Amino acid sequence: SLPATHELHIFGSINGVDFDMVGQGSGNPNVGYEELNLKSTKGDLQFSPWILVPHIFHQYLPYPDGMSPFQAAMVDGSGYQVHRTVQFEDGASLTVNYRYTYEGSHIKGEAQVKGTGFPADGPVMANSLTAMVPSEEELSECFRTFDKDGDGFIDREEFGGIIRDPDEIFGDSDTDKNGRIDFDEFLKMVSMADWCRSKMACPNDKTLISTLKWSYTTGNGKRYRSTARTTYTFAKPMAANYLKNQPMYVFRKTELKHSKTELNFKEWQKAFTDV
Residue placing its CB nearer to Ca ion in the complex, 155 or 262: 155
Residue placing its CB nearer to Ca ion in the complex, 108 or 188: 188
According to the binding rule CB under 5 A, does residue 176 interact with Ca ion?
A: yes
User: Among 22-30, 90-98, 143-151, 163-171, which window interacts with Ca ion (CB under 5 A)?
Assistant: 143-151
Residue placing its CB nearer to Ca ion in the complex, 153 or 214: 153
Cβ of residue 74: shortest distance to Ca ion, in angstroms?
Answer: 45
String marking each residue 177-206 x if it binds Ca ion according to CB under 5 A: -x-x-x------------------------
User: Among 25-33, 128-136, 140-148, 192-200, which window interacts with Ca ion (CB under 5 A)?
Assistant: 140-148
Binders of Ca ion among 67-86, rule CB under 5 A? none
Size, binding site for Ca ion by CB under 5 A: 9
SS (H, E, C) the chain: CCCCEEEEEEEEEECCEEEEEEEEEEEECCCCEEEEEEEECCCCCCCCHHHHCCCCCHHHCEECCEECHHHHHHHCCCCEEEEEEEEECCCCEEEEEEEEEEECCEEEEEEEEEEECCCCCCCCCCCCEEEEEECHHHHHHHHHHHCCCCCCEECCCCCHHHHCCHHHHHHHHCCCCCCCEEHHHHHHHCCCCCCEEEEEEEEECCEEEEEEEEEEEECCCCEEEEEEEEEEEECCCCCHHHHHCCCEEEEEEEEEEECCCEEEEEEEEEEECCC
Using alpha carbons, list the distances in angstroms from residue 244 to 151, 202, 230, 238, 248: 38, 9, 20, 11, 10
Residue placing its CB nearer to Ca ion in the complex, 34 or 147: 147
Work out which of 23, 98, 135, 147 binds Ca ion, going by CB under 5 A: 147
According to the binding rule CB under 5 A, does residue 169 interact with Ca ion?
A: no
CB count, 10 Å around CB of 73? 23
Cβ of residue 147: shortest distance to Ca ion, in angstroms?
Answer: 4
User: Among 2-10, 57-65, 69-77, 155-163, which window interacts with Ca ion (CB under 5 A)?
Assistant: 155-163
Cβ of residue 223: shortest distance to Ca ion, in angstroms?
Answer: 21
Cβ of residue 71: shortest distance to Ca ion, in angstroms?
Answer: 40
Residue placing its CB nearer to Ca ion in the complex, 132 or 162: 162
Work out which of 7, 158, 194, 262 binds Ca ion, going by CB under 5 A: 158
Tally of residues, the chain: 275
According to the binding rule CB under 5 A, does residue 149 interact with Ca ion?
A: yes
According to the binding rule CB under 5 A, does residue 138 interact with Ca ion?
A: no
User: Among 1-9, 125-133, 167-175, 256-264, which window interacts with Ca ion (CB under 5 A)?
Assistant: 167-175
Give contact residues for Ca ion (rule: CB under 5 A). Answer: 147, 149, 151, 158, 174, 176, 178, 180, 182
